[PDB]
Amino acid sequence: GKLKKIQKKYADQDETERLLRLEALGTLKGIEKQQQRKKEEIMKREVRE
Amino acid sequence: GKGTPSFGKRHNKSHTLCNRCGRRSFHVQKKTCSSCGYPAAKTRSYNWGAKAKRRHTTGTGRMRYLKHVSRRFKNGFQTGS
Amino acid sequence: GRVIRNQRKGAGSIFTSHTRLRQGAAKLRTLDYAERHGYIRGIVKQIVHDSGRGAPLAKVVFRDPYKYRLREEIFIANEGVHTGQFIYAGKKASLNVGNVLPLGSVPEGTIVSNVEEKPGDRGALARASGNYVIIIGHNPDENKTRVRLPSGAKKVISSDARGVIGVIAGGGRVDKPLLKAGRAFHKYRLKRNSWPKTRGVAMNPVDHPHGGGNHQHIGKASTISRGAVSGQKAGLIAARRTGLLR
RNA sequence: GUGGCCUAUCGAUCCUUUAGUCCCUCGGAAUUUGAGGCUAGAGGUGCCAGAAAAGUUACCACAGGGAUAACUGGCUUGUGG
RNA sequence: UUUACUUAUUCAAUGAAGCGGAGCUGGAAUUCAUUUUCCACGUUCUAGCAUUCAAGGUCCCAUUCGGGGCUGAUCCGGGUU
RNA sequence: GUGAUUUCUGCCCAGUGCUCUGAAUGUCAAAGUGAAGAAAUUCAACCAAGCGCGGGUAAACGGCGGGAGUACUCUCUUAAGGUAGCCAAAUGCCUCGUCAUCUAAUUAGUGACGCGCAUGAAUGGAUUAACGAGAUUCCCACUGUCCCUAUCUAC
RNA sequence: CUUGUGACGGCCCGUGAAAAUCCACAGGAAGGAAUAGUUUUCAUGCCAGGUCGUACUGAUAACCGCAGCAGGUCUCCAAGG
RNA sequence: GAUGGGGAAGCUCCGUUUCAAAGGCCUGAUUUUAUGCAGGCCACCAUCGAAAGGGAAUCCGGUUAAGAUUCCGGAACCUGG
RNA sequence: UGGUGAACUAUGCCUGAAUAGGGUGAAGCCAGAGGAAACUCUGGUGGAGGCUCGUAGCGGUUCUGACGUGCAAAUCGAUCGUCGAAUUUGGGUAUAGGGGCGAAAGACUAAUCGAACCAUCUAGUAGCUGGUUCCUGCCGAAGUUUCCCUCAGGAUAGCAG
RNA sequence: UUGACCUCAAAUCAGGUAGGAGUACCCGCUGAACUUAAGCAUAUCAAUAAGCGGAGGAAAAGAAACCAACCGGGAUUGC
Ligand SMILES: [Mg+2]
Ligand SMILES: [Mg+2]
Ligand SMILES: [Zn+2]
């Protein structure tokens, strides 16, 4: 369902515009915080040990 | 001044005489008669307007051909002399 | 509730565009045979003012190749075109301002205007005054060109689409303040009936979603869903963000 | 001894469901599922003899009411003087 | 899920005029035997002009007043693009 | 949406909306698939969008608190604690607020003050020349508005 | 003074109708003279011009306001101090 | 606002040049002759919509109880043939 | 439910028409002066502006004047706002009722608007108000019980014939 | 070249036919609400009123893909 929309409206696009639009829409911060949450998931186990 | 001074501005007819009924009900801009419906092929009549149907029905005029049909039927549509 | 003003605009009773003093649709010359196998030369007879349009128009005269007569096309005038200039339209036309080359035959960095979307609709893109399209790249296999639009978007259109080389004349218009409700009146008087604009928050609740209240305020949020229906879409439709960014 | 020492401690129709009879019916004739009946309970209406239910109107409307408020008057005089 | 195909369906233009394939004629081209290909394939100092089934060439007619065919203007498929 | 110019537009995305090209079994229709049954049928798996999870957004709707120490600091609470400005203002209940001025005398006016019931920044804040059949106060001129009434003309 | 017009100038993010109709130019189809023509965009001469409206008021009495209503209702001309 | 078309159970709706085989124009040729056959030209594409827009052409004098740029006398002009 | 209205008025379009006399004095330009130059000053010219005083015109602030069974179902008088444009207006034309149009008052849409008018459904319903037509004779009450979205009403018992 | 066939046209071609009216009754489509439920939404009003199409002296239906379960009846319509 997501892959249909990218073919519909984001077929003709380049990576500079892609990075600009996701930075302007704020999803990149969400991806960063998800990977960060994985980092403290590992880190808390390390501090326990 | 929506009353008496506004009634002085009224000098442009919305309706004029109609060709089928002679009623002064023919709208000038709509090009349609509001009583008989000219120039539509059917004549305007409504079952809620039963008194208007009584006003414009058959028998309220001359019946220039239909007066004699019963008499010709009674004689059997004979020909000759 | 009543039917609101933007809901009423689509019937086109009093909201049609005032087109009495307009000189014709400003389209490109049709892509017959000469324009796709060679070129053709026409003449600029006069540059004229179009009612309700910020840009001037150019009346270009060509010869009909199949019949002894003259054809008169209405182009949107590019900045620098003069009367008596020869205009060259075609595949083999030289790269000068005013010429009507197809987009496959112009190099990188070319600035064009009155660009066709698909080959043959006779001008769709960059037609308002001061606007232009930049060619960003070519793609010969699967023959397309990337273009930068006046909105900043990047489109990928066919390389057989045509465009007039240069920028649309009459640029810099909106930099002058109107200063007067009379000037705005005379501006929209030849476009359409969309002026003056009453705020919906100053209405009664029968007339607008924003109307009503003992103080002039909106009530709910003014950002409206894209899935909203007619009569609800009054405000900022499908806004990704709001506010003044710094 | 047919619940709580006595005086309070609780619930119709329709629908669903359970127990009993394993009985009656499915109407051209049978068998088996399914369904419908009979007798006795349960699921609940606290507005508790038991409608399924948010506001606003200073833009307002109708039928009425002195059975009913906002004046005066009348009885009373706490309070006031 | 990706990806062909076109005739259904859909969009657009034109007074449905130059579509596709092949061939000439030039240029590049390296040919490893003879041509593999690829580009072209009448117009750019100038606010003139461009029309009479087209002049010329050629073959007929029955010469005369002219008339017709081919070429000029390459073939093939009738898919308007 | 706000409403010329000038000068600025502080903090908050927790809520309600709006918006993502994120991540993907939690919710999860019809059709389709599988099992049981003699079949009606029952039960499961799978399961689109949207919800749910994760971000953004206040010139979107809106919001801008308490307890101690000595304006400042610490602590609790919260999404953040009213910033710049302004004020008994058309917004202040108490209130005829307090001080000054204006007058013989002022619940009026103006200038200040501010723990402001309940001021405040495009819900726009502050300022502002010119303009106003807008609202309010004072002064000069002027007068039957008044002391206090009288007289004349036409109808 | 009223009015017509000419040449100008200012203004615009406003640059301020369309068609019937008439004329000219380019072009050279065709027709053409010598005992004769060719021309009726030169002059004169001949015939016909159908249909419907046509009076009057246009307002403190002819229109609209229940009316002979101090109301309303478009426009042209405009003497002397 | 018809037609070609396309919707609508339908009264009817859309659309006005649209996915239409959409017509008439002059020269003449023939002088059984009527107007076909010799030809050649052209593709708008119904129609309605202004007594203030556009637009062929008339003035003076006289005349009635009541009409006049309309009648009478004189003097012009335009269109069609 | 089905029809009729933009002759008033709201708005857009098309085509026409109308608007004394003054005041202020914008760009552009000319002459003189000064300056070393940038440029400044003085005197003219010119005639700009959704400028201003003020007629016709358009409107309607106050007297809370007149009138208020009127001249008038909105008028009259004085005082006023505005008066070259976002001006005023004729005719043609477009938009029709949960619809139009609105510089926004729920305003206007034929003296009708917080949903026009006409006819029909329709003799709509009303626990609510009003009325209900001759005489005499005999008998003769109740405002209490129980239940009801019951409290201005019913059912039921009682009282009465 | 000529003659067929198929399909599609044009004629002020030869001859015809349809429209509109009426509409009490008839055959269909479409389709409410007032009202009742002592409120009201399913229901009711009502497969009605209004609207639209189409006939006749009647129309429609009609000679069983019927009713039955009996010792079986026998097109339709109406009481
Ligand atoms: Mg407007
Ligand atoms: Mg509001
Ligand atoms: Zn008629």
Swiss-Prot record, chain A:
Residue segments, region Disordered: 36-49
| Basic and acidic residues bias (residue ranges) | 36-49
Query: Where can this protein be found?
Result: Cytoplasm
Describe its partners and assembly state. Answer: Component of the ribosome quality control complex (RQC), composed of the E3 ubiquitin ligase RKR1/LTN1, RQC1 and RQC2, as well as CDC48 and its ubiquitin-binding cofactors associated with the 60S ribosomal subunit. RQC2 binds to the 40S-binding surface of tRNAs.
Sequence similarity = Belongs to the NEMF family.
What further note is attached to this protein's record? Answer: Present with 7700 molecules/cell in log phase SD medium.
What task does this protein carry out?
Key component of the ribosome quality control complex (RQC), a ribosome-associated complex that mediates the extraction of incompletely synthesized nascent chains from stalled ribosomes as well as their ubiquitin-mediated proteasomal degradation. Thereby, frees 60S subunit ribosomes from the stalled translation complex and prevents the accumulation of nascent polypeptide chains that are potentially toxic for the cell.
- Protein's name according to its UniProt entry: Ribosome quality control complex subunit 2
Which species is the source of this protein? Answer: Saccharomyces cerevisiae (strain ATCC 204508 / S288c)
Gene that specifies this protein:
RQC2
Curated annotation (Swiss-Prot), chain B:
* Cofactor binding note from Swiss-Prot or TrEMBL: Binds 1 zinc ion per subunit.
The cofactor named in the record is:
Zn(2+)
From the Swiss-Prot or TrEMBL record, state where the protein is found. Cytoplasm
Q: Which sequence ranges does the entry mark as zinc finger (C4-type)?
A: 18-36
Q: Which InterPro entries did the record assign?
A: Ribosomal_eL37 (IPR001569), Ribosomal_eL37/eL43 (IPR011331), Ribosomal_eL37_CS (IPR018267), Ribosomal_zn-bd (IPR011332)
Q: Which domain of life is it from?
A: Eukaryota
Which cellular component terms (GO) are annotated to the entry?
Answer: cytosol; cytosolic large ribosomal subunit; preribosome, large subunit precursor
A single Gene Ontology biological process assigned to it is: cytoplasmic translation
Molecular function per GO: RNA binding; rRNA binding; structural constituent of ribosome; zinc ion binding
The reply to whether Mitochondrion figures as a keyword in the UniProt entry is no
Protein family membership: Belongs to the eukaryotic ribosomal protein eL37 family.
Summarize the protein's role: Component of the ribosome, a large ribonucleoprotein complex responsible for the synthesis of proteins in the cell. The small ribosomal subunit (SSU) binds messenger RNAs (mRNAs) and translates the encoded message by selecting cognate aminoacyl-transfer RNA (tRNA) molecules. The large subunit (LSU) contains the ribosomal catalytic site termed the peptidyl transferase center (PTC), which catalyzes the formation of peptide bonds, thereby polymerizing the amino acids delivered by tRNAs into a polypeptide chain.
NCBIfam families this protein is in? PRK04179.1 (NF003214)
SUBUNIT field: Component of the large ribosomal subunit (LSU). Mature yeast ribosomes consist of a small (40S) and a large (60S) subunit. The 40S small subunit contains 1 molecule of ribosomal RNA (18S rRNA) and 33 different proteins (encoded by 57 genes). The large 60S subunit contains 3 rRNA molecules (25S, 5.8S and 5S rRNA) and 46 different proteins (encoded by 81 genes).
Q: Which HAMAP family match?
A: Ribosomal_eL37
The entry's other comment says: Present with 21800 molecules/cell in log phase SD medium. There are 2 genes for eL37 in yeast.
Name-wise, this protein is: Large ribosomal subunit protein eL37A
Q: Which gene encodes it?
A: RPL37A
Curated annotation (Swiss-Prot), chain C:
Pfam families attached here?
A: Ribosomal_L2, Ribosomal_L2_C
Write out the GO biological process terms. cytoplasmic translation; maintenance of translational fidelity; ribosomal large subunit biogenesis
Q: Which UniProt keywords apply?
A: Cytoplasm, Isopeptide bond, Phosphoprotein, Ribonucleoprotein, Ribosomal protein, RNA-binding, rRNA-binding, Ubl conjugation
Can you list the GO cellular component terms from the UniProt entry? cytosol; cytosolic large ribosomal subunit
GO terms assigned for molecular function: RNA binding; rRNA binding; structural constituent of ribosome
Miscellaneous remark of the record: There are 2 genes for uL2 in yeast.
- Quaternary assembly: Component of the large ribosomal subunit (LSU). Mature yeast ribosomes consist of a small (40S) and a large (60S) subunit. The 40S small subunit contains 1 molecule of ribosomal RNA (18S rRNA) and 33 different proteins (encoded by 57 genes). The large 60S subunit contains 3 rRNA molecules (25S, 5.8S and 5S rRNA) and 46 different proteins (encoded by 81 genes).
Supply the name of the protein.
Large ribosomal subunit protein uL2A
